[PDB]
Write an enzyme that holds these catalytic residues in place. Structure first.
Site, short mmCIF file in Angstrom:
data_model
loop_
_atom_site.label_atom_id
_atom_site.label_comp_id
_atom_site.label_asym_id
_atom_site.label_seq_id
_atom_site.Cartn_x
_atom_site.Cartn_y
_atom_site.Cartn_z
N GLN B 300 -93.41 -118.60 30.76
CA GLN B 300 -93.80 -119.90 30.26
C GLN B 300 -94.90 -120.53 31.07
O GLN B 300 -95.56 -121.46 30.59
CB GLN B 300 -92.59 -120.84 30.24
CG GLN B 300 -91.53 -120.46 29.26
CD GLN B 300 -90.41 -121.44 29.26
OE1 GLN B 300 -90.40 -122.38 30.05
NE2 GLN B 300 -89.45 -121.24 28.38
N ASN B 303 -100.31 -117.55 32.45
CA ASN B 303 -101.25 -117.48 31.34
C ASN B 303 -100.92 -118.55 30.30
O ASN B 303 -100.47 -118.26 29.20
CB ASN B 303 -101.23 -116.08 30.71
CG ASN B 303 -102.49 -115.76 29.97
OD1 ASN B 303 -103.27 -116.64 29.64
ND2 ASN B 303 -102.70 -114.49 29.69
N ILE B 304 -101.12 -119.80 30.70
CA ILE B 304 -100.79 -120.92 29.82
C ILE B 304 -101.53 -120.87 28.49
O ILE B 304 -100.91 -121.19 27.47
CB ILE B 304 -100.97 -122.25 30.57
CG1 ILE B 304 -99.73 -122.53 31.40
CG2 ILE B 304 -101.17 -123.38 29.61
CD1 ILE B 304 -98.52 -122.78 30.57
N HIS B 307 -99.80 -118.56 26.16
CA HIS B 307 -98.43 -118.97 25.90
C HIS B 307 -98.36 -120.15 24.96
O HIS B 307 -97.51 -120.18 24.06
CB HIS B 307 -97.71 -119.32 27.19
CG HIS B 307 -96.34 -119.86 26.95
ND1 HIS B 307 -96.04 -121.20 27.02
CD2 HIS B 307 -95.19 -119.23 26.60
CE1 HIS B 307 -94.76 -121.37 26.75
NE2 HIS B 307 -94.22 -120.20 26.49
N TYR B 315 -94.25 -119.32 17.13
CA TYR B 315 -92.83 -119.53 17.35
C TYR B 315 -92.34 -120.76 16.60
O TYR B 315 -91.42 -120.68 15.79
CB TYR B 315 -92.58 -119.66 18.85
CG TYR B 315 -91.15 -119.89 19.22
CD1 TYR B 315 -90.26 -118.84 19.29
CD2 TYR B 315 -90.69 -121.15 19.52
CE1 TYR B 315 -88.96 -119.04 19.63
CE2 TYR B 315 -89.39 -121.37 19.86
CZ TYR B 315 -88.53 -120.31 19.92
OH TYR B 315 -87.22 -120.53 20.27
N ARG B 329 -88.08 -115.45 18.33
CA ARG B 329 -88.43 -115.16 19.72
C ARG B 329 -88.73 -113.68 19.91
O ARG B 329 -89.71 -113.31 20.58
CB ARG B 329 -87.31 -115.62 20.64
CG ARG B 329 -87.29 -114.93 21.98
CD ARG B 329 -85.90 -114.94 22.56
NE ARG B 329 -85.86 -114.29 23.86
CZ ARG B 329 -84.74 -113.90 24.46
NH1 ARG B 329 -83.57 -114.10 23.87
NH2 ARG B 329 -84.79 -113.32 25.65
N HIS B 340 -100.81 -106.28 24.10
CA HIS B 340 -101.02 -105.64 25.39
C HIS B 340 -101.28 -104.15 25.22
O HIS B 340 -102.18 -103.59 25.87
CB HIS B 340 -99.82 -105.87 26.30
CG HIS B 340 -99.80 -107.21 26.94
ND1 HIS B 340 -98.70 -108.03 26.93
CD2 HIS B 340 -100.76 -107.89 27.60
CE1 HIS B 340 -98.97 -109.15 27.57
NE2 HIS B 340 -100.22 -109.09 27.99
N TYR B 402 -107.92 -91.73 35.09
CA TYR B 402 -108.79 -91.33 36.19
C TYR B 402 -108.49 -89.90 36.64
O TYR B 402 -109.37 -89.23 37.19
CB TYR B 402 -108.64 -92.31 37.34
CG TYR B 402 -109.31 -91.85 38.60
CD1 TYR B 402 -110.68 -91.86 38.71
CD2 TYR B 402 -108.56 -91.40 39.67
CE1 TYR B 402 -111.30 -91.43 39.86
CE2 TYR B 402 -109.17 -90.97 40.82
CZ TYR B 402 -110.54 -90.99 40.91
OH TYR B 402 -111.15 -90.56 42.06
#
Ligand SMILES: CC1(C)Oc2ncnc(N)c2N=C1c1ccc([C@H]2CC[C@H](CC(=O)O)CC2)cc1
Ligand SMILES: CC1(C)Oc2ncnc(N)c2N=C1c1ccc([C@H]2CC[C@H](CC(=O)O)CC2)cc1
Lengths: 406, 406
Positions: B300, B303-304, B307, B315, B329, B340, B402
């Site tokens: 929370q 990374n405001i 979020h 949400y 959720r 990601h 790599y």
């Protein structure tokens, strides 16, 4: 409504957040991740020993092969002498002038006796000598406070005579004196606070912290400073300014980390284990000296015991007999400089007068860092003045001793 | 009176002090003491260059030898397409259903276009590919919010029609859209706050921070992780659990320090320099995620921007159309896991599905760390879960890339 206020980032130099109780936990978890394996191994290696009983028997067998634990025990005669003068003075004998005289003699003895013993005995070790001298200077400060407090309370009773807690004369018992001598405080006061109980969990965590940080500090020394000192061995006595500064700017940061580790080891583990064993309840031996945006604010919160002793037994008692407030403050600094010199030099038999110069330079440095730098930059200036600053003096002493004995 | 209260030490696990704005300054002054010489040298070495104009000329000369800066510019057609659909929808054409359809098509294009471009072009670099995909996912989230906000305000105006700030339809200008696209926020909102002025000192300090931390992070990588990766080169694809864990437990701590350095480099230097150039005034891109005594409290406050976008565009808009709060959720977590994965994999052309597994495991881990550990120990559990945790996924990706290309 709205979803964008007008605020600032938390790390920003002007946000006023100051809630970083997660950076200390980060340091803790990283220290554990880095050194827990070695700590467990070394604990299993050096916990199988029966050190206390074997060593105390080996000492009581021969009370001349360990002169430092002999001085530590001989200081009890000064404790008892002060107690006896106090009791006689409470009953009525040895009128006030004679009592003050006897106490001054006893305190001067407390100081100048172990200096002579460790200066006229060659069979004594530097660490043992340092612990003997530290026990004796702590005893000196504690007895000075004992004298002052009993003087105040006795004069108060005498004044009142012309008209559960503990009154003045009913505290003079050996149990009281020897609970005060071992208490984590240099300030005497009738009716010390107490804690509810022992909190075995707490004491266990504190002893674990002591052991872990002892291992950490030994590793720091024996893998970062001994090798660096052995890179170019020349004592600081003769080297010019350029070479001494070039050596200290390489030896400073490991010294500073050792200093921080030792602060946490003493002022939060040792004193808290003591104050938890014998419920003491104050347990406030330092304050936020780290976010100290001035030199004069650092010394007020670093080493709270010595500082509150200094205040209410050397600064306010000298302002009462009004003595040019600036002059009394300079006298406070002078006494502290003398005690730092007497603690660091006499065990090493050196008399370079360096820790004295550091504690004295703390005055112009205070003026400087207060007048020029401000806010977070003032704090960074204080941190810089702790990295080179005063601890470099004790570093110079120990280095010039190690470079001439190994 | 009294001189001994009944208090606790500040570091004590139960004192409630939390005022350590001197440990961050300690980290800063130690970083400077350790790396300022090298930073000054490298700055004088790499500041004499004329990088921007020469490189932009070398690129505009050949718009096929740098496909990542070609995609970054081609995303403007999607920006303009969304703006055009919005303007037509505001005037009245392309009734709501058709407008939603067109916006869904445009967003699906924003996503699935650069994936195809970087999957069907071999002349592109992994870092350039990553920056292209990150610009495109940021554009996607910003345009999703643009659509939602204009939908809300348009329906509000339509409802009100049956009865200095900026109203609904008068904001649809290209200057507005292109101030929103470059703003440090994924959440659209009419009448963004502003700052008074530019504060040249502030911008200078922020650029210095960016450069210093770039040098620091390059040093970390090229002197702590490349050598460790080259100690035993075997890709994580085939190694068993024992070997992969034994390799990651040696690669984790440098990875974590790189992670912290990159957090401070982006979320406080890059975004603050941006938001200072174009006065943005919110400047709240993170909160105290470090003293976060739970996993659900970390996400929370880390990374405001992402979020608060997640909250008020995925949400709450799914709780309005009530959908089993737990299910919504889980859907939030699923979308973040997908993003990601899509950010880390596609540039490396890998599809191991690892960052997805990390972001999904964040749920049972949240339950675990909440139910078992508490207080400062909960915080230590969160820190442990950040040292191995989710960032190890991106580490696995970059390492297996790599180990197969050098
Ligand atoms: C230097 C000294 C004695 O040595 C210490 N040795 C170890 N640990 C400490 N903590 C020490 N503290 C110290 C000390 C004591 C008192 C003061 C105050 C500052 C404030 C002014 C009034 C004023 O001008 O506002 C009155 C005098 C300053 C320093
Ligand atoms: C996982 C996700 C999406 O990905 C992120 N990706 C990057 N940066 C972040 N900061 C992220 N945050 C995230 C995120 C978003 C919302 C939530 C809330 C927690 C609270 C409950 C209600 C309740 O149960 O109390 C509602 C849902 C949790 C995590």
């Amino acid at each position: 409504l709205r979803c964008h206020r007008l605020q600032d980032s938390l790390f920003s130099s002007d946000s006023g957040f100051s809630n970083y109780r997660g950076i200390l936990n980060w340091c803790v978890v990283m220290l554990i991740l880095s050194n827990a394996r070695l700590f467990l191994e070394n604990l299993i290696k050096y916990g199988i020993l029966v050190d206390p009983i074997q060593v105390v028997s080996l000492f009581l067998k021969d009370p001349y092969s360990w002169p430092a634990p002999c001085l530590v025990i001989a200081a009890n005669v000064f404790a008892v002498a002060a107690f006896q003068v106090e009791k006689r003075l409470a009953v009525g004998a040895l009128t006030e002038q004679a009592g003050l005289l006897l106490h001054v003699a006893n305190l001067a003895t407390i100081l100048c006796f172990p200096a002579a013993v460790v200066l006229l005995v060659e069979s004594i070790t530097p660490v043992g000598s340092l612990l003997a001298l530290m026990a004796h200077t702590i005893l000196f400060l504690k007895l000075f406070s004992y004298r002052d407090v009993n003087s105040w309370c006795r004069r108060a009773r005498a004044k009142a005579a012309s008209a559960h807690t503990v009154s003045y004369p009913d505290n003079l018992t050996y149990r009281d004196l020897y609970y005060f001598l071992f208490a984590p405080t240099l300030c005497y006061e009738l009716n010390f606070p107490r804690s509810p109980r022992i909190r075995k969990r707490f004491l266990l965590r504190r002893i674990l912290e002591m052991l872990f940080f002892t291992q950490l500090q030994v590793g720091l020394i024996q893998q970062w400073m001994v090798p660096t000192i052995q890179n170019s061995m020349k004592p600081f006595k003769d080297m010019d300014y350029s070479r001494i500064i070039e050596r200290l700017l390489k030896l400073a940061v490991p010294n500073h980390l050792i200093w921080l580790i030792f602060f946490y080891w003493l002022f939060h583990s040792c004193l808290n284990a003591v104050a938890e064993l014998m419920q003491f309840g104050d347990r406030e031996f330092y304050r936020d000296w780290w976010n100290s945006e001035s030199v004069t604010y650092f010394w007020q919160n670093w080493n709270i015991p010595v500082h509150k002793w200094c205040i209410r037994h050397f600064y306010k008692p000298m302002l009462r007999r009004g003595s040019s407030k600036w002059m009394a403050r300079t006298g406070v600094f002078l006494a502290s400089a003398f005690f730092h010199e007497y603690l660091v030099s006499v065990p090493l038999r050196m008399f370079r007068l360096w820790a004295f110069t550091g504690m004295m330079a703390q005055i112009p440095l205070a003026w400087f860092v207060g007048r020029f730098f401000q806010g977070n930059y003032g704090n960074a200036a204080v941190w810089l003045s702790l990295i080179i600053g005063q601890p470099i003096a004790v570093l110079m002493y120990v280095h010039d001793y190690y470079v001439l004995n190994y």
